[PDB]
Amino acid sequence: ALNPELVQAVQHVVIGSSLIVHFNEVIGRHFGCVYHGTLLDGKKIHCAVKSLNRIDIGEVSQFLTEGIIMKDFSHPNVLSLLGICSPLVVLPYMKHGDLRNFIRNETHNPTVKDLIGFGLQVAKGMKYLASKKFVHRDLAARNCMLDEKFTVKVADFGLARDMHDKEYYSVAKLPVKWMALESLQTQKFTTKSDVWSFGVLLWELMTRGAPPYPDVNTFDITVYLLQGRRLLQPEYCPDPLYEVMLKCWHPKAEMRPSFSELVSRISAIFSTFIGEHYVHVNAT
Ligand SMILES: CCN1CCC(CCNC(=O)Nc2nc3ccc(Sc4nnc5ccc(-c6cccs6)nn45)cc3s2)CC1
Ligand SMILES: [Cl-]
């Protein structure tokens, strides 16, 4: 029943090696549910297996097409797809989980250098996605993960794209407090609106995961911004990094820096720090 050209094209994505899905070990549950897993080939690889609903032959066609597209994306700062198989999406397990919880954790002691380092890795992952004409639409610290080497990987990508939390989404995903001014008015997204979201992600990093605009309700953000306001400078945010955030929030989308310019500018700032400045959480 399926297009035979598509069946041959998806073969390099489909996994036979073999996979052991640990169905009793759940991660999260919107859309489908994520479980722990183990891959093969004479080695055991810890993975996160997402099982999507019960999806018609056209739905199966999209699933196989998405798998090929996803597999064509490879970058150390972008969460990879290991393969596909109910439809199974197999992703590498990220030991330290999401970036927002990692920095919020009071037992963690990040320095200014470490936090800027995480922002730099996110910028590199986004620089890769933009070059592939991929518009993320939901870049936030909650949507970035950390592996065992503390490598940051931009997630919430392709078949894994979901809504895991609700308080950050106005009820198509609308992460209002991370959205560019023009996206709040048109509901359209570009690489330049991902640049706005990246400026917000840098603010999340420097405040160790504080919610942005805490005293502003989701529905009020566009009026708040149009009065001539931006997120205030975090206490442990260096002046050149705050200048970078302000550039990410330029009212004119085309005047915002590209992710390539961000990688470059942030690499310079990052290089000036030695890991002697401990970042503490704000009381407010
Ligand atoms: C002591 C406190 N603390 C310290 C360690 C901590 C982390 C454990 N490590 C993991 O949880 N790793 C993990 N890797 C992966 C790899 C892929 C996927 S699918 C996916 N694609 N994009 C996103 C974006 C968001 C989400 C989710 C949000 C809520 C539930 S899923 N899923 N998602 C999920 C996980 S979850 C647990 C306890
Ligand atoms: Cl430092």
Q: Which residues pair with 37 in a beta bridge?
A: 21, 47
Measured by CA distance, the residue closest to atom 23 of ligand 1 is 156
E strand segments, 121-192:
144-146, 152-154
Distance CA(236)–CA(103), nearest Å, equals 14
89: Cβ–Cβ under 8 A, 6 or more apart, which residues?
49, 50, 51, 52, 81, 159, 160
In the PDB record, what is the listed experimental method?
A: X-ray
Distance CA(11)–CA(1), nearest Å, equals 17
Using the mean position of ligand 1's atoms as its centre, give its distance from the Cα of residue 242 in Å. 29
Map tokens 């640049």 to a residue.
195
Q: Which residues are catalytic?
A: 138
Distance of CA 274 to the CA centre of its chain: 27
Q: Which ligand is nearest to the CA of 32?
A: 1
Q: Which residues pair with 89 in a beta bridge?
A: 50, 84
Ranges of CATH 3.30.200.20 domains, the chain: 1-93
Binding residues for ATP: 27-34, 50
Pair 102, 115: CB distance under 8 Å: no
Q: Which ligand is nearest to the CA of 115?
A: 2
Distance CA(218)–CA(234), nearest Å, equals 21
The ligand 1 site (C-beta within 6 Å) comprises 27-28, 34, 48, 50, 91, 93-98, 143, 145, 155-156, 160, 164
Ranges of CATH 1.10.510.10 domains, the chain: 94-284
Query: What Rg value do the Cα atoms of the chain yield, rounded?
Result: 20
Give ∠ CA 47-161-122 in degrees, rounded to 5: 80
Pair 81, 67: CB distance under 8 Å: yes
Which stretches within the chain are classed as H helix? 4-9, 57-71, 99-104, 112-131, 181-186, 191-206, 221-226, 239-248, 259-271
Substitution site in 30, 50, 98, 108 for ligand 1 pocket (most atoms within 8 Å of beta carbon): 98
Distance CA(191)–CA(134), nearest Å, equals 8
CATH domain 94-284 topology: Transferase(Phosphotransferase); domain 1 (1.10.510)
Pair 81, 159: CB distance under 8 Å: yes
Closest by alpha carbon to 48, among 81, 75, 73?
81
Which string of DSSP letters, residue by residue, matches 209-229? SPPSSTTS-GGGHHHHHHTT-
Distance CA(191)–CA(265), nearest Å, equals 18
Measured by CA distance, the residue closest to atom 33 of ligand 1 is 156
Distance CA(160)–CA(254), nearest Å, equals 30
Distance CA(107)–CA(26), nearest Å, equals 25
Residue type, 2: L
At the fourth CATH level, which superfamily is domain 1-93?
Phosphorylase Kinase; domain 1 (3.30.200.20)
Instruction: Tell me the pairing of strands 144-146 and 45-51.
Output: unpaired
Pair 272, 265: CB distance under 8 Å: no
Q: Which class for 276: exposed (0-12), middle (13-18), buried (19 or more C-beta within 10 A)?
A: exposed
Residue type, 260: S
Give break positions in the chain: residue before each, C–N beyond 2.5 Å: 16, 29, 41, 55, 85, 171
Handedness of CA 97, 275, 129, 44 (dihedral sign): negative
What Å resolution does this PDB entry report?
2.0
280: Cβ–Cβ under 8 A, 6 or more apart, which residues?
208, 236
Distance CA(27)–CA(95), nearest Å, equals 12
Distances, alpha carbon 254 to alpha carbons 182, 230, 248, 258, in Å: 11, 18, 10, 9
* DSSP-based three-state secondary structure for 182: helix
Measured by CA distance, the residue closest to atom 19 of ligand 1 is 160
